[PDB]
Amino acid sequence: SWQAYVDDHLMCEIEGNHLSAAAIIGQDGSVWAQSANFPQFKSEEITGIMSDFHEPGTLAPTGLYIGGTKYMVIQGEPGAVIRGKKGPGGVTVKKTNQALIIGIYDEPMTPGQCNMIVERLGDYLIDQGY
Amino acid sequence: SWQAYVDDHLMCEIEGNHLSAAAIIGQDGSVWAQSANFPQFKSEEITGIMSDFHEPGTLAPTGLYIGGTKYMVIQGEPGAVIRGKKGPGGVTVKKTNQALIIGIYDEPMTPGQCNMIVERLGDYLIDQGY
C-alpha cells in the first residue's frame, strides 16, 4: 500500500519536523498515493519534469512548476533528483525506475532534511524494481 | 535530542516493518541514545568494530558480537558500514566521523529495509559534522 509509504514514512519526523505534502507519482502521471495536502498537478508538469530528467537543466529557465507553483530550481543530481526553493520552503523530486517521489517542506524543515527523507526512499524503490 | 532519533526515526516503520532496536553511540563507547530492548555493549566489542572499520576484514573470521550476541559478518562498505547476519535477523553499523549508528532487525524486516534506515541517518549526521 503506497499510501502508508506516504503516511508513515515520508511523513516520518526527523529532528522533530516532518514534510507538508508527500506524493508518489508515476512517470506517466498517475498518483499512486499522496499526502492530504499534496496539490493536484497541472499541465505538462509531470512531463516537463520528466525532461529535465532526460536532458538536464531544462527546467530552471522556465522554473519549477508543481501544482502550478513556481519553484526556484536549485542544484540537483542529473536525471535522478531535482530540487527547488521558494522562500523558506521548497521541494525534492527523486526519480525512480518507474515513479517520481515528491516531497514539499517549509520552514522549520531544512532542505537537506527533506532530501534525506525523500531521496533515500527512491533509491530504495529503484531497487525494489519500481 | 538523541533519544528523538532512536525511538522516532530509526523506529519509523517501513513496508509495515521497523527495527527491533537502534542505538546512536559514541565512537569512544558512550551511548547517546538507545532504544528500549537494545543490548548492553560488552567487552572489546566497540573496539573491534573500529578496526574492521580502519583495517577492514579484521573482525570477520572472529565473528562480530554486539551485546555478546553472535553476528556472522556479511559484506558492507570498507570503513563505512559493517553488516552482519543472524538468520532472519542481523545488524548494520553505519559509522560516522566520531559516532556509530546501529540497528537490529528480526524478520518480517529485510536486510535492505534496516540497511537503508540506518545508513540513511548515518550519512545525514556526517553532514552535520558528527
Author numbering:
A (entry chain A), B (entry chain B): 2 to 131
Tell me, in the authors' exact words, what the paper reports.
Profilin is an ubiquitous cytoskeletal protein that interacts with several molecules, such as actin, proline-rich ligands, and phosphoinositides to perform several cellular functions. Profilin is also an important allergen present in pollen grains, food plants, and rubber tree, and it is considered a pan-allergen, because it is present in all eukaryotic cells and is therefore involved in allergic cross-reactions. In this work, we focus on the study of two plant pan-allergens, profilins from the rubber tree (rHev b 8) and maize (rZea m 12), in their monomeric and dimeric forms. Here we isolated the monomeric and dimeric species of the recombinant profilin allergens rHev b 8 and rZea m 12 and obtained their crystallographic 3D structures.
When the protein concentration was increased to 10 mg/mL, only one crystal of rHev b 8 was obtained, which contained two molecules in the asymmetric unit, as indicated by a Matthews coefficient of 3.06 Å3/Da and solvent content of 59.9%. This crystal belonged to the space group P32 and diffracted to a 2.8 Å resolution. In this study, we determined the tridimensional structure of a dimeric rHev b 8 stabilized by a disulfide bridge and compared it with the structures of the monomeric forms of the same allergen and that of rZea m 12. Interestingly, the dimeric structure of rHev b 8 displays a medium size interface stabilized through a disulfide bond that is formed between the two Cys13 residues of each monomer, which is conserved in all plant profilins. In addition, there are several hydrophobic and polar interactions between residues of α-helix 3 at the C-terminus and α-helix 1 at the N-terminal region. From a functional point of view, the hydrophobic N- and C-terminal regions of the profilin structures are very important for their interaction with proline-rich proteins, such as kinases. This region is blocked when the dimer is formed; therefore, interactions with kinases could be limited. As observed in our dimer structure the interface blocks the kinase recognition region; therefore, we can suggest that the dimerization process might then have an auto-regulatory function for the members of the profilin family. Finally, we demonstrated that the dimeric form of rHev b 8 is more efficient than the monomeric form promoting significant degranulation in rat basophilic leukemia cells (RBL-2H3).
